[PDB]
Amino acid sequence: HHHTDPMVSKGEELFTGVVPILVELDGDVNGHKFSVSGEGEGDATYGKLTLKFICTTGKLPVPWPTLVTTLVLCFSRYPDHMKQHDFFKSAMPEGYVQERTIFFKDDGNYKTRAEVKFEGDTLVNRIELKGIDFKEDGNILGHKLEYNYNSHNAYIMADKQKNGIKSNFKIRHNIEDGSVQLADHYQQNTPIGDGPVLLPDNHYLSTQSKLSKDPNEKRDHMVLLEFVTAAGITLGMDELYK
Secondary structure (H helix, E strand, O other): OOOOOHHHHHHHHHOOOOEEEEEEEEEEEOOEEEEEEEEEEEEOOOOEEEEEEEEOOOOOOOOHHHHOOOOOHHHOEOOHHHHHHOHHHHOOOOOEEEEEEEEEOOOOEEEEEEEEEEEOOEEEEEEEEEEEOOOOOOOOOOOOEOOOOOOEEEEEEEEHHHOEEEEEEEEEEEEOOOOEEEEEEEEEEEEOOOOOOOOOOOEEEEEEEEEEOOOOOOOOEEEEEEEEEEEOOOOOOOOOOO
């Protein structure tokens, strides 16, 4: 890697090559307590994540797809002309707090708080999840969601007052009967360290995820292949290719 901005070189230097990932979640949804462990690898050069998650308490009391957004946007591919907008890498290695409220339309809410930071060479995502006001017969506690996932765009805006970022975005979960369960995401990220961070201009992250199962695995689990790419800022003075 070679950038003219030493602040960019610093972040890029930590996400060179393949980085091992640990994910830890403690959850309580309507008093159903559960835990999830995840392991895999991230490759920020390709925006590529490969993760396997296991429910360590037994059967997951909510559908796996409802946890995908909660269960490491520092592995996003930022194109070269946008690297000065990568908040996520700039906060490393001390890390950042990621907070969300997820409103399931006509159902309950998840509240999440995560610390994303390095423990030695390992990127760790440690999460507390609280779920309240879910319908026992609804799409979530009723397990009526399909085991699949769509492509989304998450718009990222600076919050200069907290030296962080915020995002609002909608996830669509396919229901078994061909309908859709909307999940409205509100997100804020703040640095853990007191050092400076890159505060971005408005842009979006483009996501694509595939869910699968390990045919040899007897525990309740999810295999996740995810790609994340930053976009929405164009290159040139009108223009390089014109």
